[PDB]
């Protein structure tokens, strides 16, 4: 299933912050300034697991870890936290709806950018 | 039915009496989003369906719901996220906040760590 970026908050993408928050449109305005907004029609069909892949625009990433709330949050309301780094060694520090990716190069996103959830 | 939630955190930019509005969010929120919201542990969020006439008892203050955005219930059920709005709802529907829950009286509630939010449907 493929999702489409419709909005990008001014504080949503910063390379030094190897993290990008995804949200659906109905998320409060204040929050959307810190995230990339996606329209993900087939969202209820996705079940991410380590090994899967996310193609954001032109870069293909490999999911190395998934927080216990990543699948629930994404399937239900299209919300998630993309983390372009290695999962923490301490399980308690793992971001609940985190979807840890590799490579760590930050994606190139603009309005219209597509996110393919290749399970 | 009464479903109870409990406040576990309050972001430094979560409550401002000059903007009659309070963003609620569940436990899956990350730090960048926490600064803007009141974090709630809502064990039965999956069961919540609010409608006009229902109430929200926030701490020592009871509020009646005057309008619910078309996505408030799904945002609550999924991430316990919602925009509590202490002001009349706009007359123009296209202007209604999708995840908003409009409340009256328009006085902000007193919220601290431990405060409960009773959803009375």
Q: Supply the DSSP string of A32-44, one letter for each residue.
A: HTTEEEEE-TTGG
SS3 B72: helix
- Whose tokens are 């919602």? That residue is B82
Find the length of chain B: 121
If one counts the domains in chain A, the total is 1
Nearest to A38 by CA among A50, A29, A55, A26: A26
The Cα A65–Cα A58 span in angstroms is: 21
In the DSSP assignment, the letter for residue B63 is E
Of B73, B83, B85, B13, nearest in space to B46 by CA: B73
Q: How far is CA A83 from CA A112, B19, B57, B71, B113, in A?
A: 21, 32, 37, 27, 29
The Cα A43–Cα A22 span in angstroms is: 13
Distance from CA of B86 to the nearest CA of A (A): 15
CB contacts of A94 in chain B (<8 Å) are none
User: How many other CB atoms are there within 10 angstroms of residue B114's CB atom?
Assistant: 9
Q: Which residue has the tokens 């216990």?
A: A68
Q: Which domain holds residue B38?
A: 1-121
Question: What chain A residue is nearest to B27 in terms of C-alpha separation?
Answer: A96
Cβ distance B99 to A72 less than 8 Å, yes or no, reads no
| Integer angstrom CA distances of residue A41 from A5, A45, A80, A86, B64 | 12, 9, 15, 29, 34
| DSSP structure class, residue A74 | H
The C-alpha atoms of residue B34 and residue B94 are separated, in whole angstroms, by 28
Return the closest-CA partner of residue A113 out of A11, A14, A18, A13.
A13
CB atoms within 10 A of CB B100: 25
Whether omega for the bond prior to residue A103 falls within 30 degrees of 0, making it cis, is: yes
Alpha-carbon distance B117 to B22, whole Å? 13
Chain B within 8 Å of A43 (Cβ-Cβ)?
Answer: no
Instruction: Enumerate the residues of chain B whose CB falls inside 8 A of the CB of residue A95.
Output: 30
Using an 8 Å CB-CB cutoff, list chain A residues near B98: 25-26
Residue A76: which of B30, B78, B83 has the nearest Cβ? B78
Name which of A115, A114, A86, A72 is nearest A19 in CA terms.
A86
Nearest-neighbour CA in chain A from B33: distance (Å): 6
Q: Residue A73 has which token pair?
A: 């949050």
- Establish if B26 touches chain A: CB-CB under 8 angstroms: no
How many residues belong to chain A? 119
Cβ-based burial of A67 (10 A; exposed 0-12, middle 13-18, buried ≥19): buried
Q: Which contiguous run of DSSP H or E holds residue A71?
A: helix A70-77
Kindly state the tokens that stand for A90. Answer: 């301490």
Residue A62 belongs to domain with CATH number: 2.40.33.40
| Contact indicator for A45, A107 with CB cutoff of 8 Å | no
| Measured distance CA(B70)–CA(B100) in Å, rounded | 8
d(CA A60, CA A52): 10
Residue B78 tokens read as 């999924």
Burial of residue B36 (CB within 10 Å: 0-12, 13-18, 19+) is buried
Contact status, residue A108 vs residue A60, Cβ threshold 8 Å: no
C-alpha count within 13 angstroms, C-beta hemisphere, residue A38 = 31
Rounded to the nearest 5°, which phi and psi values hold at B47?
Answer: -95, -15
Chain breaks in chain B (C to N over 2.5 A) after: none
C-alpha to C-alpha distance for A40 and A38, rounded to whole angstroms? 6
Residue A109: CA atoms inside 13 Å, Cβ hemisphere, count?
A: 28
**Which chain B residues contact residue A19 at CB under 8 A?**
30
Put simply, the answer to whether B36 touches A30 (Cβ < 8 Å) is yes
């Amino acid at each position: 299933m493929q999702a489409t970026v419709t909005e990008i908050g001014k504080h949503a993408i910063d390379d030094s912050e190897k993290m990008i928050i995804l949200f659906g449109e109905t998320a409060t305005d204040t929050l959307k300034q810190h995230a990339v907004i996606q329209s993900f029609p087939e969202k209820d069909q996705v079940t991410l697991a380590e090994g899967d892949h996310l193609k954001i625009g032109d870069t293909n990433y490999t999911i190395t870890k998934v927080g216990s709330f990543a699948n629930s949050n994404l399937q239900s309301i299209a919300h998630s936290t993309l983390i372009f780094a290695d999962a923490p060694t301490d399980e308690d520090d793992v971001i609940r709806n985190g979807v840890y990716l590799t490579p760590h190069q930050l994606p190139k996103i603009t309005i219209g950018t597509t996110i393919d959830y290749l399970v």
